[PDB]
Structure 1
Amino acid sequence: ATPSLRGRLARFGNPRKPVLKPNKPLILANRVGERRREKGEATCITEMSVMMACWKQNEFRDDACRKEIQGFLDCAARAQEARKMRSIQETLGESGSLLPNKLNKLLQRFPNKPYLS
């Protein structure tokens, strides 16, 4: 349930002092905001530290860190293909909630009417 707005704003007829001082009129716009671009987390950083740990103990000789180097390489390739698929699926399919562009088209058809006609 939306919090009440009865007697919250400074108006004629409202005796009490205002509860809310909105710097913008509390009237629904005909659009929603654009989803912000997010910063993902680094992948394989765990395997990267394991690789750089053997280097410190083996004088940076790749011959002694093959299993750790390979793991960090395989992870990077898997994280590369997954990054390649995350775009095809999440950007185009619009899984879950709609995207702002599609949701704004739906609001265009039912605009908020703060005036009389």
Structure 2
Amino acid sequence: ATPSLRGRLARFGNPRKPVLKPNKPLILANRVGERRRATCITEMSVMMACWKQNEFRDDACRKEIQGFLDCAARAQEARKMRSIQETLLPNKLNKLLQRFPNKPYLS
């Protein structure tokens, strides 16, 4: 239940002092804001600790290195799949709102 606006704004016929002082008018706009914008560091830390304790000899850290590499590959795959899937959208939402726009005036 949206908060009431009865008697909240400084208006004539409103005895009490204003409750809200909206910087912008409280009128629904016909658009929505544009969607607003490290990975796999555990495996990296494991591999780097193994390197530190083994003098970075990859010979004795093969499992950790392979896990790190596969994790990076999966991170790339996740980025790609996420991008394609992301491609409701603000564009669609704005189109719908345009179809049914706000009317803050009299026709």
Moved more, 74-83 or 5-14: 74-83
String of CA shifts for 1:9-51, please: whole Å, max 9, x gaps. Answer: 11111111111111111111111111111xxxx2221110110
2: distance between equivalents of 1:21 and 1:44? 46
2:104 matched residue in structure 1: 114
Question: Helix, strand or coil: the match of 1:65?
Answer: helix
2: distance between equivalents of 1:23 and 1:99? 28
1:12 matched residue in structure 2: 12
String of CA shifts for 1:43-88, please: whole Å, max 9, x gaps. Answer: 2211101100111111111111111111111111122222221111
Q: Provide TM-score, normalisation by structure 2.
A: 0.93
1:72 matched residue in structure 2: 68
Q: Which runs of 4+ in 1 moved over 3 A?
A: none
Q: Percent identity?
A: 100
Q: CA RMSD in A?
A: 1.0
Moved more, 60-69 or 82-91: 82-91
String of CA shifts for 1:75-117, please: whole Å, max 9, x gaps. Answer: 11122222221111122xxxxxx11111001111111111111
- Give ranges in structure 1 of 5+ residues lacking alignment: 92-97
Aligned length: 107
- Give ranges in structure 2 of 5+ residues lacking alignment: none
